[model samples]
Target: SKDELQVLLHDLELKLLQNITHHITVTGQAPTSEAIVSAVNQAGISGITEAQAHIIVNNALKLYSQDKTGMVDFALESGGGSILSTRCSETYETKTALLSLFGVPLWYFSQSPRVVIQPDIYPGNCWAFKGSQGYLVVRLSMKIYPTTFTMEHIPKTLSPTGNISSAPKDFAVYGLETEYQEEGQPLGRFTYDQEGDSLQMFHTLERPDQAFQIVELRVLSNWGHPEYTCLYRFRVHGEPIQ
Candidate 1:
């Protein structure tokens, strides 16, 4: 089984390499890992794993490293737009340790979660809200009409015993209108049940040819504890105006 798995991995890497190279040659730029993996999966590849998808993108990056002209295509319609900027009300740090138990604000929207080797020795992989400040906001730069939004929570390893000490309980989201970028318009409000590790919402409206500039989230309270909120990743899914 080990040998077979290795062989399969090798084959998948090769196929991914070929696909990425061809796409770059035709488009004059490298696509995102999401696009490459999506294409590979749609091409009838069986049992595609996330590890394999990462490997494929890494291989593409390695090749792109040798070239200077190739650019990354971060088109908004490509699933979710890339995160343009981020902000947090406050972050926490321990005097005894270097790592912040509630720091790294951008990790909330990062594609990957933070990995804490120990309570104090994390490699800056994730973030959480400080106990005092109960609000955090992120500004996405996607230019498509968003139809859906989702937030993913930390894994059980980070919250052992299935506790929701550092997770947001209730939150609100606002979609930025293109004209004036009004802050008064409300997209929706959602409550994280704390029973699961993910929250999602959808909107029904005619997709417009405008870009979304800001998405703000306010943490009202925690599940049982009303101190900190730990968010791993955020996703906004939509398509271009037709």
Candidate 2:
């Protein structure tokens, strides 16, 4: 599995690095497409055709800020944090659990939503709901000014549906001083580009005066899953006040 993942990351890196038009500057950066193609074509990646490489390299570039140094994830389950079940949208349908022979165990209820805060982002580990719109609230590890929010979804190619229409689209992040607060301070309003990378990070609107121990995500829409929407991972990153 490690070997497979390693190959995938290498491909992703090359696919991204190839898209930049300019590379040879005094400033440090990735190589140009010709250099990347020449090097890869010479050494070879598992011996695939140049056509396949061209196709794979056509994907969205993996653009992520390298400036993430001191930023810490404030919403993590390992820190005894939890997503509020009552305050969030209900998990995917439970009708299948009624038929034990179908192998849908009763724990399927909690397993779905809880996956939202978990560290892993493997294929099936996602929070699914009945409709396009959904919201999830999680208690953070500590009070922090949530400067950024990261959302990740299972890769489109790895989806059982062969498409990621169930992926969340337009969403808003909120920072709450207390979970009971009716409407918390708006941290950011963003739209997840379906054609973009599987994981995306968005910087929140700056408000230094407000710090929160609870964060809420309101997914206003999805790419069009018809009836189901899934969320794989959500991260709250910033400086922790305590």
Candidate 3:
């Protein structure tokens, strides 16, 4: 298995190096392998071997190279931290998990306000998806002491008649230090109110230097759902640095 893994890894490394070469040529910035590895680490794959880091960085650099719209590589002015990557415990629908990245907080529905106002939900608006393990993980491009975390859920009135189980009722949040590859020190568990409209977590620490690379949102107990959990939005708020 290691041999097979090594072969696949070699292939990935080659592709990554190609991207790095392309980035240097396009940006004229002589970025080194270490720089690329740093970018990959910031992209949220922590505790990666040096070889693995090179592969991840090259992949991001390649993705960054195809930025004709300039949105992909640019940092957010609100705070320097950008969305590096997102992963759900399980994906029920392809590409649907990414909908949470959009600013819209509404769950997608044919008669929903977001659809009525925007008209075009694709590539711009947001939607909800089910995760098999009832959890999601988000990796930020830069470390930050997140001030608040929010999750938006479909309203009870709009939820399907028998599908209320999909909503999360009680959950735990963790700030993972990805570089160490360990379970995050316990942050806290939060319970949803009767409405179950939104869940929020406020920072308890006074200092800002304590930054987190990965955020894990887990639904320890569901409202009624058994197999899947769904949410309209998952947002993290914080400044760029300490």
Candidate 4:
């Protein structure tokens, strides 16, 4: 029985060798590169002959077969890149108006966006923006909000111009509007304010997706009226995903 089994083994080994040799002759190379035969054999089967009991490397095997693999990883690698876009606030005319957004108004990620100043009728207000162009503008409108005077000292009466320029000192800034919108161009306008004491108004570009640039925060007064105080500070906030 042992001799017969040995004969069967020998026959199987010869058949495998013949088949591998035939494959190499027809396909123009071993099932894989010569290195793979040694690699697989060393991993487990010890001294399998490269020609007799061949091994296949998937990467190399694909090259011999009709199936082709795509090379993509090297083509699309990410590196630090920059975007040029801008967003700004809409103008507000009264102190009680709710916060509104203007030019490229919808704020986004990856860029700084802040209010440089809010409108202060008495002292002064500051604001900020993520990107700047040349100069900024202050927008104004009469759209007021209806809300309760939650605090005893707080006034519910809308007196935007009277309280203009009364924002906190830490909120004051300047020089953001160095980038300006060309006069008569379509831009965004936003506004916010406290009843009677002050009104905070802001204006920004109508669309920031057009480019990746700084949105300037500019200051104006009386909600852009001739009789009111108009001063400003720069506001900047938000950042891109690194």
Give the range of the ten consecutive residues with the poorest summed lDDT in model 2: 95-104
Pairs that collide in candidate 2 are none
Model 2: lDDT of residue 54 = 50
The residue pairs that clash in candidate 1, if any, are: 166-230
- Highest TM-score model number: 2
Q: Candidate 3: lDDT of 27? A: 78
Cα lDDT tens digits for candidate 2, 1-242: 85575445444443433333233222345444455556555544445455544543332222221222334666768866688777898788531111111112212121467778775343345778878899899998888877888888755544434477878999998888786997988888999988877778899656557888898899999998788887888888877776
Q: By the lDDT metric, which is better: model 1 or model 4?
A: 1
Judge candidate 3 at residue 179 and give its lDDT: 36
lDDT (CA) per prediction: 0.46, 0.65, 0.46, 0.27
Model 1's number of clashes is 1
TM per prediction = 0.46, 0.64, 0.45, 0.22
- Measured by lDDT, the strongest candidate is 2
Q: How accurate is candidate 3 locally (lDDT)?
A: 0.46
Q: How close is candidate 4 to the true structure, as a TM-score?
A: 0.22
Model 4 Cα lDDT, one tens digit per residue, 1-242: 85575445434333433444455556655545454455444444455555533332332222223221221111011211111123344223322221111111111111121222221111111222222212343221111111111000112221232332332211211222223433332224333353322223333432222221223333232222333222233222222223
lDDT by residue (73-166, candidate 3, tens digit) is: 1122233333322444433432211111111122332121112112101221233345433555656556666666555443343332413456
For model 1, the superposed segments whose C-alpha errors exceed 4 Å read 1-87, 94-124, 178-182, 197-211
Off by over 4 Å in 3: 1-87, 93-133, 160-163, 194-209
